[PDB]
Amino acid sequence: GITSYVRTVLCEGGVPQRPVVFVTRKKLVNAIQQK
C-alpha cells in the first residue's frame, strides 16, 4: 500500500499519478508482479 517509500521514490517523475477515479484490477497486476 501507499506509504512513505511510495511517494518518496516514485515522485522522481517515474510515475504519473493514478486518476481521480479508478476501479482496482487485482488479477492482472498480480501477474505483472510475478513476471
Place this chain on the structure above:
Amino acid sequence: MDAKARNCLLQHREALEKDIKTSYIMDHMISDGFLTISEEEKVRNEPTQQQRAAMLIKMILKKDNDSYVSFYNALLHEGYKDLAALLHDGIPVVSGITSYVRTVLCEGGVPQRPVVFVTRKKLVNAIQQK
C-alpha cells in the same frame, strides 16, 4: 547505497549534522575500511563541529550499503542512541558464469549469448589456447 538508505540519511540530515562529533565516528569508519584518510582530512579541515558533521554526511551519501552500516554501527557504538534510531529503518541489506563474469563483462564488452545455443566446445578450446 540503496535509495531507502540514502533517503533515510537525507530525511534526518539536520539532526545528524547538529550532534555528530566526527572524531568519534571517522575512526571507526576508517578502521572498517569505508572512509579514506583524504576524506577525513577534508572533514578535519572544516572549522566547527557541525560543519565537520555536514561534510562527513555529504561524503557518506555517496557511499555504498556497507558504508551506511559502518556509519550506523559507529553511531550506536559511540552512544548516539537517538541518532542510530533515526537511521535504523533505513539500514540496507549487506553482504563457468560467476560473480567475476557478470562483473567485468557487463562493461559493454559482450552482447549476451542468445536464448538458445548449443555448446561447441572443440573450437572454443582452440581459441582459448591460441
Place this chain on the structure above:
Amino acid sequence: MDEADRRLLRRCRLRLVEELQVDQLWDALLSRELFRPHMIEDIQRAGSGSRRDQARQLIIDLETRGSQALPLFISCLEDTGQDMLASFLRTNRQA
C-alpha cells in the same frame, strides 16, 4: 535533547558554571552512560582546566548526549550531593 531542555541549560549557564562541582561528578555521569571516558578527559582539559572551564564545557557538551540527557544529569547532581543545584534545575524544567 529538546529545545526546552537546551534553553534551560543556557538560562542556567551562570549558575551552573558558578556552582557545579565536577571532580565528584564523573563517576555519576559514567554510571548513567552520559559520557564516554575519553569525552570526560577532553572536558577535563577544556580551556584552562579550572573547575569553571570544565563545568562550562560539560554543560555545553551535555546538550548533545540525548533526549534524556537533562533529567539524567539532574539525577547525577542528586547522587553526588549537589541537591541545591539539582533543585534549581528541576524547578525550572517544571516551571
Place this chain on the structure above:
Amino acid sequence: MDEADRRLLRRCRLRLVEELQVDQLWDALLSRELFRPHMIEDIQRAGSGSRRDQARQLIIDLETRGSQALPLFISCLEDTGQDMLASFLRTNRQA
C-alpha cells in the same frame, strides 16, 4: 612506508588509539630516530592533547617517517613494555 604497512596502520587505528601509551614512548622513538624533537612537541599538542589525540597523530605522522618506520615502531613498543600492542601489530604484518 609501503602500502601494506600503511594499510596495517589504518586497520589497527582503533586499537592503537585506544591502547597506545605515549608518555613513555618518546625516548624510544628518539633512540631509533623515528621523529625529531620538535615533531614530538607538535604531536604532543595535537587536538586536545589527550593520550588518544597524541596517539592518533603519532600513528598518522608515522606513515611519513620511512620505509622501516613500522618495524622500528614495533620495536619501540617492545622497548617500553607495550608487548601486547606490539604483538597485535606483528601478527598482522606477518598475516
Place this chain on the structure above:
Amino acid sequence: MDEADRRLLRRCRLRLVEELQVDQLWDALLSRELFRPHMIEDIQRAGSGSRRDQARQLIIDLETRGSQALPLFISCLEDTGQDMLASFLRTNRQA
C-alpha cells in the same frame, strides 16, 4: 588606562616581577575593586604558579582594569606594606 601609565608598567616590568609580593595583595585589590575574585584565581594559576608568574600576569592584566588602575594599585601596595615598590612606582608617575 592611559598610555603613560601602561608605559610605566612596562618600564618597571623587571622590578615589579622581581619584588611584588602577591599573597598579601589580593585583599587590597578586592577592597578597591581592581579585580573580580575569579580573575584573581586565574592570575594565581598563571604559568607555573610561582610568585613571579603570578606577579607578571597581575601587572599585565592590570592595564585593562580602568583609567585609575595604576594609582589604585599603588595604594594597595601601600596598604600591604610594599612601600618601597609603591615608592619606585610613584616617583616615576610623577617623573
Place this chain on the structure above:
Amino acid sequence: MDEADRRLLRRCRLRLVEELQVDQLWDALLSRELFRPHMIEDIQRAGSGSRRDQARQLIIDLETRGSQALPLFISCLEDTGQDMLASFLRTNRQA
C-alpha cells in the same frame, strides 16, 4: 651547543633522569653561569616537581645554554660529587 653534544644529551636521557641529583647541583650551575636564578626556579617547578621531572627539564633546557654548556655541566657534576654520572657522560663525548 653543537649537534654532537645535543645528541649525547638525548642518548643519555634515561640515565640522566634516573640518576641526576638536582638539589645539590644548583649552586654549581650558578657558579659557572649556566642558568639564571629564575630559570632555576622554573626548572624546579617543572611537571610534578619530583627529582626526575626537574632533572628532565634541566637537561632539555641545558641544550640552549651555550657552546660549552655540556662540558661546563660535566664539571658541575664533578663539583657536587656525581663523578659516576659525569664519568658516564665524558666517556661518551670522547667516544
